[PDB]
Amino acid sequence: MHIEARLFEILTAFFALAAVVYAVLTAMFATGGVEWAGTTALVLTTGLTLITGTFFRFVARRLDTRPEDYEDAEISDGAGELGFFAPHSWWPILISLSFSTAAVGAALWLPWLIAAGVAFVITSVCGLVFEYYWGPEKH
Amino acid sequence: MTSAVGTSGTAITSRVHSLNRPNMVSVGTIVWLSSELMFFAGLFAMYFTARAQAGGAWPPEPTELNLALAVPVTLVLIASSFTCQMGVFAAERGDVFGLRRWYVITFLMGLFFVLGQGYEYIHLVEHGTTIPGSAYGSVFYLATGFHGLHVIGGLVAFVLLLARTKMSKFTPAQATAAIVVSYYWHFVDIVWIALFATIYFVR
Amino acid sequence: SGGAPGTGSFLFPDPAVEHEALTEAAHASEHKSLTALKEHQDRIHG
Amino acid sequence: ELDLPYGSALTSSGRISAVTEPGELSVHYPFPTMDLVVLDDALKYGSRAAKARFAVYIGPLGADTAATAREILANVPTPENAVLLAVSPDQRAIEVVYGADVKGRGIESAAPLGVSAAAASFKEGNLIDGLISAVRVMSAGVSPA
Amino acid sequence: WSDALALGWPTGITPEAKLNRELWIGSVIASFAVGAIVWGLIFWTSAFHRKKATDTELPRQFGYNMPLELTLTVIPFLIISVLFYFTVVVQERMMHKDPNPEVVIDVTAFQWNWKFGYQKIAFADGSFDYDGADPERKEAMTSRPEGKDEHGIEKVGPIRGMTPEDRTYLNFDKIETLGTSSEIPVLVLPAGKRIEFVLNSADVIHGFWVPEFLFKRDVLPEPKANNSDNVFQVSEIQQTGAFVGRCTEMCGTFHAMMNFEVRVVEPNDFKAYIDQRNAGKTNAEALAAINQPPLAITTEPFESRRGELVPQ
Amino acid sequence: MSTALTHGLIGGVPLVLFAVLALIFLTRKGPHPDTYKMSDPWTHAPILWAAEEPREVVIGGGASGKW
Amino acid sequence: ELEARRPFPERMGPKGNLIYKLITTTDHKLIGIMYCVVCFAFFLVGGLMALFMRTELAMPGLQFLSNEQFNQLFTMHGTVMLLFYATPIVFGFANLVLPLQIGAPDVAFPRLNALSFWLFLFGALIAIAGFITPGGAADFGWTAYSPLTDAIHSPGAGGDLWIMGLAVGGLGTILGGVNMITTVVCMRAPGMTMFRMPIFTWNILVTSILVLIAFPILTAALFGLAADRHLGAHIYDPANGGVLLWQHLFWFFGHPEVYIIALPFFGIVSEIFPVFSRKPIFGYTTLIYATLAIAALSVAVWAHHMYATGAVLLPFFSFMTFLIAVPTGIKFFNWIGTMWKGQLTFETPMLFSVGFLITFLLGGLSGVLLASPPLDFHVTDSYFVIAHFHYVLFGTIVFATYAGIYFWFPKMTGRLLDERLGKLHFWLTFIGFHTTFLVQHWLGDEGMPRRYADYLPTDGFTTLNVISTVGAFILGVSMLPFVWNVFKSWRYGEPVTVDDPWGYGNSLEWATSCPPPRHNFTELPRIRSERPAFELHYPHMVERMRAEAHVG
Numbered sequence A: 001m002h003i004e005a006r007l008f009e010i011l012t013a014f015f016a017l018a019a020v021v022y023a024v025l026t027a028m029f030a031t032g033g034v035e036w037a038g039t040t041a042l043v044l045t046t047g048l049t050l051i052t053g054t055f056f057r058f059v060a061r062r063l064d065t066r067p068e069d070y071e072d073a074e075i076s077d078g079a080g081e082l083g084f085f086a087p088h089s090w091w092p093i094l095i096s097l098s099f100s101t102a103a104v105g106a107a108l109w110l111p112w113l114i115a116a117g118v119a120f121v122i123t124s125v126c127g128l129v130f131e132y133y134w135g136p137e138k139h
Numbered sequence B: 001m002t003s004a005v006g007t008s009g010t011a012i013t014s015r016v017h018s019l020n021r022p023n024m025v026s027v028g029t030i031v032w033l034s035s036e037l038m039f040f041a042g043l044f045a046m047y048f049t050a051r052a053q054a055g056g057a058w059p060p061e062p063t064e065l066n067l068a069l070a071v072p073v074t075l076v077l078i079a080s081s082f083t084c085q086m087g088v089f090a091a092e093r094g095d096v097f098g099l100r101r102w103y104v105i106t107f108l109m110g111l112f113f114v115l116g117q118g119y120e121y122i123h124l125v126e127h128g129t130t131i132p133g134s135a136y137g138s139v140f141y142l143a144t145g146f147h148g149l150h151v152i153g154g155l156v157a158f159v160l161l162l163a164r165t166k167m168s169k170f171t172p173a174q175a176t177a178a179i180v181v182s183y184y185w186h187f188v189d190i191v192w193i194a195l196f197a198t199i200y201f202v203r
Numbered sequence C: 001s002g003g004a005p006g007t008g009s010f011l012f013p014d015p016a017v018e019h020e021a022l023t024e025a026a027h028a029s030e031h032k033s034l035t036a037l038k039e040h041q042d043r044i045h046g
Numbered sequence D: 001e002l003d004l005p006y007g008s009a010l011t012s013s014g015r016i017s018a019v020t021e022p023g024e025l026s027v028h029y030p031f032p033t034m035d036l037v038v039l040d041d042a043l044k045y046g047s048r049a050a051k052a053r054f055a056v057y058i059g060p061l062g063a064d065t066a067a068t069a070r071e072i073l074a075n076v077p078t079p080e081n082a083v084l085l086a087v088s089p090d091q092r093a094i095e096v097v098y099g100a101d102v103k104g105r106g107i108e109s110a111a112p113l114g115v116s117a118a119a120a121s122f123k124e125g126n127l128i129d130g131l132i133s134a135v136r137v138m139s140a141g142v143s144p145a
Numbered sequence E: 001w002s003d004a005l006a007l008g009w010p011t012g013i014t015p016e017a018k019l020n021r022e023l024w025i026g027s028v029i030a031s032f033a034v035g036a037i038v039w040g041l042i043f044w045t046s047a048f049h050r051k052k053a054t055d056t057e058l059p060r061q062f063g064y065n066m067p068l069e070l071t072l073t074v075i076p077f078l079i080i081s082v083l084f085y086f087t088v089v090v091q092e093r094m095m096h097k098d099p100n101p102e103v104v105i106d107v108t109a110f111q112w113n114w115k116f117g118y119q120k121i122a123f124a125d126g127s128f129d130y131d132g133a134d135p136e137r138k139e140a141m142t143s144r145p146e147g148k149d150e151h152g153i154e155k156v157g158p159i160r161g162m163t164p165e166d167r168t169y170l171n172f173d174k175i176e177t178l179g180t181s182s183e184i185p186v187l188v189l190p191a192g193k194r195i196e197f198v199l200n201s202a203d204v205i206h207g208f209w210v211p212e213f214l215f216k217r218d219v220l221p222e223p224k225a226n227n228s229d230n231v232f233q234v235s236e237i238q239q240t241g242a243f244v245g246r247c248t249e250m251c252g253t254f255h256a257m258m259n260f261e262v263r264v265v266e267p268n269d270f271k272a273y274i275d276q277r278n279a280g281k282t283n284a285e286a287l288a289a290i291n292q293p294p295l296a297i298t299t300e301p302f303e304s305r306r307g308e309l310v311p312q
Numbered sequence F: 001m002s003t004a005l006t007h008g009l010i011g012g013v014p015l016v017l018f019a020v021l022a023l024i025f026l027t028r029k030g031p032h033p034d035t036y037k038m039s040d041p042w043t044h045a046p047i048l049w050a051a052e053e054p055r056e057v058v059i060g061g062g063a064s065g066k067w
Numbered sequence G: 001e002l003e004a005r006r007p008f009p010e011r012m013g014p015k016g017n018l019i020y021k022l023i024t025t026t027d028h029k030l031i032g033i034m035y036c037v038v039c040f041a042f043f044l045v046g047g048l049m050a051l052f053m054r055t056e057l058a059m060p061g062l063q064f065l066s067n068e069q070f071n072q073l074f075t076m077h078g079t080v081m082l083l084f085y086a087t088p089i090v091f092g093f094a095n096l097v098l099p100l101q102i103g104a105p106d107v108a109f110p111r112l113n114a115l116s117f118w119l120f121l122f123g124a125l126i127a128i129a130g131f132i133t134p135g136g137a138a139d140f141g142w143t144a145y146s147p148l149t150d151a152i153h154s155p156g157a158g159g160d161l162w163i164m165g166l167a168v169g170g171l172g173t174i175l176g177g178v179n180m181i182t183t184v185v186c187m188r189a190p191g192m193t194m195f196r197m198p199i200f201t202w203n204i205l206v207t208s209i210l211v212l213i214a215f216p217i218l219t220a221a222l223f224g225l226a227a228d229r230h231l232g233a234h235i236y237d238p239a240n241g242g243v244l245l246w247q248h249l250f251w252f253f254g255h256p257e258v259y260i261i262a263l264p265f266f267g268i269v270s271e272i273f274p275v276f277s278r279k280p281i282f283g284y285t286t287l288i289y290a291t292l293a294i295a296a297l298s299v300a301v302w303a304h305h306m307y308a309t310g311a312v313l314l315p316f317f318s319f320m321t322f323l324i325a326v327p328t329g330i331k332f333f334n335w336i337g338t339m340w341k342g343q344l345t346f347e348t349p350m351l352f353s354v355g356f357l358i359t360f361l362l363g364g365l366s367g368v369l370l371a372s373p374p375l376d377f378h379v380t381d382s383y384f385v386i387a388h389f390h391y392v393l394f395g396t397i398v399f400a401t402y403a404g405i406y407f408w409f410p411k412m413t414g415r416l417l418d419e420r421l422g423k424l425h426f427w428l429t430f431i432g433f434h435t436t437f438l439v440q441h442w443l444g445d446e447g448m449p450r451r452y453a454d455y456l457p458t459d460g461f462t463t464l465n466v467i468s469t470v471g472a473f474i475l476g477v478s479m480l481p482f483v484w485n486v487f488k489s490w491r492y493g494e495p496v497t498v499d500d501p502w503g504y505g506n507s508l509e510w511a512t513s514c515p516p517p518r519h520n521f522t523e524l525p526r527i528r529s530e531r532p533a534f535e536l537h538y539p540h541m542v543e544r545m546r547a548e549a550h551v552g
């Protein structure tokens, strides 16, 4: 690729510009001082687009022109074998039930339900992430 | 059977390809890392105000803030960053055992970081502040305590991926999983470099 | 599919001839299991 | 070689992707959208107790009618057990023609009775209801195997 | 024409509100002058129907018109630039911040009703050497020398050394027009003075929104700590009479029940108001002493009951 | 005001406007074509309606009629 | 020479092909259908909640329901219209047609999209679950300001369930953000670069960017609020810095949340236009920059909601709110150029697009009229701001979602709708909506501030509340044609066999079957420009398509 690095570079330039101008315009011009609550949010949204754009630039330098990304590319130029997508899976519904039990334990302040919902989160997250790695039963 | 129709290296495939193709769980965890950086921006904004409020000698009187136990566990955690990166160097070159040794010792001294942070919380709550006791004590317990939840979730990812290395052949997809958990946890201990500069050094 | 990890330990690998012997023997035993069960199934109907 | 006369083109394989002008339709079947659902119910739901793909042909057959109906049974997607009905309102000709394996399965007394139960409703002026009263009769007639 | 074109304001009673209402009139002229030409564009490009004589031949197919795009990326920037300059020149005239006001009202704003202060009066006519009380501002600075443990900690307090349940921002006064749940609080204010409003809330954020001031501010709980310049002066108030005042954030349930009044009296009526309240009288008696109806006249103190289907 | 008016208004003007717009928009002829008149000749393309009834050439029989 | 087709397609489907396939979804298609279904169910829940509020405001007493139930009523209503109706559907149309538009076989993390949907639904149920609680749900508003939300204030269980329901819903929508941005980055057809993707997948690229920016601060704010309620944890303490500590970062979530609301519906409408204007989208690269030009500033504009607090840097946020009002004006004038000199037909999704154009116009005029702080100092939390965000936001999500449903309906279920019933739907969701919000401008300008359960007969303005009630109950019977239309357009209704049931389709989606196959594509077209379905279906057009694509 190339253009995601340029995209988050544009977002990085604007977020850094807005972060530093918000810090130096709430350093003066404000009632007490620097607001410290949208200032660091702007500094770390600059951090967000730094991470995404820096990783996409790291990939885009360590790569040729992708046969996907190439303008004037026939479909037969990039028709190989894609990677694994998951078929049918009943673990995300269990992820959501687990995280919802943990959330209603954290809402109705029930520490037993917090701990049990976190235990179901660990169990169902294991069931999701091992789902295409369980070997056959060795008997 | 006849032989198979899906005659591949495994049932699991890399994520697309990675010779002339970007790795897709890689970019997935990179943008989710960036989201969690905005979550920490929420926690940092809960810290950098309620420190402009308290004036004078502002870290309050019951907070004898221990640096002599803080900087060893930060040094443990950031050396453990290099152990985890050596684990992903031993993941690119495809051997599970070079992965598993460095991730076992990364999990062990990350657990040592979690136990050191827990002992710091015990030692700082039993003769000091509580989360309903102070402003600074509460923001110290949430800005680094939910970071404790981040690193304990990263430890869950370590033990989980280690069982995953136990149960299947080392595919390039599993090196993708290893590099993804590797720099998730590298993000965890670069956020902890930010938090340790913020809470203890800069104040 | 992909069910052949390193046989070594959780930390240290076993030498490669021992891995070859173990995975070839376990593969032949699983093949013998389904072979004996399949020929019994054919003995029931045939 | 000609595609659909505007907007269609054959794709990179043989599937010809066509269009539809935005207010217009695709099928243009000159029958209501609810009674041919009754036809599909009588021809799938209340037909599966006969084990034969009941084809229904409404187009013109302006030739020797039996031969040009048994010729267009050959593209019903399994021709050995199919009971096609052909009707030509240009020509006023019912023609029920069988497949091979449908033979002596309650069918030799059901084809003229199916033609009678259709043509009793065609002379009223109901095409779809004639087809429904024919396919229900031939479903009651053709016995499964 | 001027009231119906302004989308139905209430007309101003202070020069702040007059100048704000003039800027809204100009800005709805700008907004309708944008929306009229663009609804003209839509309801005239709905004259480009699919023509019946239009054969199998597509339109102009153009897209990508760069000079037209530069013109309509420069002209909305000019519209928002002139609207931003008029916005900032009216933003200069929202708090002139006069260090010499004429009457300061300490509008504190507790859970579900108001309380008005009369913190300081000083007429440029020459009258009212009146000030605020302040023995009542005692703290909750919990500087106890030892807590639950036995030695060493001397724990001082949660926020800035003090508890949240503190009330040291919350300034009080001798005169207090407290508003009960069956008597609407009636601030009265002299016509044609410089009326400063210092705003505090005991519990929770809400809004000092008189509709006819054409201005509001939020009573933040500790507004000095929360970077909130709560105070604002009102330049004059020309029109006398009574004016409604609502409550314009979220407080909790009894939130429409927080109405007040700012009854604008003559300056000699203000003389006879407070000089018939320094000799201590309540609100209805002080308003009856100045020949003016004592209860709230533009809002009734509506029902302490809860519905029209509760059994009384 | 006058609670019969401000209940009959908010309960009838939606139904009055619903009846007016549903009698000016649903009484149009839809996009679906008309039913086939039998006296008219068969203008349509030929139609075969198969069944897909058991899912996965030589002659079987015959019958005929003339309406 | 003749095919063997069924007379009508499958009406309902076989018994039992969906309810296990509910539980074990992995394609984007069925997940997106589930988003549209269960979120129109939450739209129904919210609509009846609003009709309860609007029965209440019709007469000046408390004649129908109480004060506290009203304060629960607008809050749960604002959430199941913003954070449980809009916020899901902005990824629900993504899971509908974004892998169709970029050439992707599936969405990139095909279990994590099921995880996004099911976390959404089980955050939404546990946030509605305040109504089972006896004190009810959150009486504080959707804005949820912190001296009212800390456990001294509004101490019930419904606020806590609200908090953790938005935690789960925010996590699920973050996960929708990551898998949509990874589809559009690195799961894409081999001939299309960054720029000849459709505009809708572009808007969801930048929308998922701003989801990742905004929503973790909702979860951070809200974990801080759950700690401040349950642990009593002094973060949002009012005598601390914690009432602008709510407002700064909550509205730093909130306005990027309303632009992740606004941008993919701009993408829907910008996909509606080139297939009914029978021509290019006007200034396509102008839109592809203008989405960034609004959305980057959406992050940095956040405090144009605290003009009333007097504690924000006021000219900075007013200037940047005018500066976020200009690129959406660019994005709008490109649409007016897109309808310009085309061969328009107003079959129903373009009719909803034009309704969106009119509503979002005069609402955005109230936007520039409202973002100037002296004109907001009377208008902050009046009904001018509530008619503003309805007359904008309803126009975006509701009109462009009906354009999206009546456009991507024959390609996500293979059957059309009734055009007459859809036009019925539009005209009494247009007349009714303007009846219930053209007057709340004049009802918030003269005094009636937001979130009031009653008012007075000695206060005036009763007639404007009853005409808003008339309009809102026209809008309450407005989706009887919509749910009747989809209810007799799935199991019945006019089928489509060939592609493009809307002619002159484009954007790489419309070059596959109207029930698309599992993994979306039997044949991809040779992608050459922004409209490759229009270039497959019209090969003779291409030289005329490019030879006059630059003048204007």
Ligand code: HEA
Binding pocket: E031, E034, E038, E076, E077, E079, E080, G143, G258, G259, G261, G262, G304, G305, G306, G321, G322, G324, G325, G326, G328, G329, G330, G332, G333, G361, G363, G364, G365, G366, G367, G368, G370, G371, G372, G376, G379, G380, G381, G382, G385, G388, G389, G392, G393, G394, G396
């Ligand atoms: C879909 C969601 C959505 C969108 C898109 C908007 C779009 C805008 N909103 Fe609205 N807004 C809300 C949902 C939206 N808002 C919500 C939910 C709230 C808060 C809820 C609450 O607090 O109660 C809100 C609160 C809100 C406030 C808060 C102040 C207050 O509480 O009183 C303000 C003012 O700053 C505001 C201004 C705008 C502006 C300037 C835009 C601009 O983007 C609009 C610009 C569009 C036009 C300008 C372009 C087209 C017109 C012409 C063709 C070209 C341009 C011509 C001009 C140059 C004159 N919005």
Ligand code: HEA
Binding pocket: G041, G043, G044, G045, G046, G047, G048, G049, G050, G051, G053, G054, G074, G075, G077, G078, G079, G081, G082, G086, G140, G141, G142, G143, G386, G389, G390, G393, G394, G397, G398, G436, G449, G450, G451, G452, G472, G475, G476, G477, G479, G480
């Ligand atoms: C996302 C956009 C959106 C939408 C779609 C809505 C849907 C509606 N809203 Fe809501 N509204 C808000 C954005 C929206 N609102 C916001 C941001 C708030 C503020 C929250 C806060 O202030 O804290 C809000 C709260 C709110 C208020 C509160 C202000 C106050 O209390 O004074 C009002 C004013 O009356 C209002 C008017 C309406 C109307 C008329 C609709 C109509 O569209 C009505 C929709 C509902 C019906 C159309 C459904 C039909 C009924 C069904 C047929 C019943 C049967 C169904 C069952 C079988 C399940 N809305």
Ligand SMILES: [Cu+2]
Binding pocket: E112, E206, E207, E247, E248, E249, E250, E251, E252, E254, E255, E258
């Ligand atoms: Cu209030």
Ligand SMILES: [Cu+2]
Binding pocket: G254, G255, G258, G304, G305
């Ligand atoms: Cu906003």
Ligand SMILES: [Cu+2]
Binding pocket: E249, G305, G306, G308, G380, G381
């Ligand atoms: Cu506000």
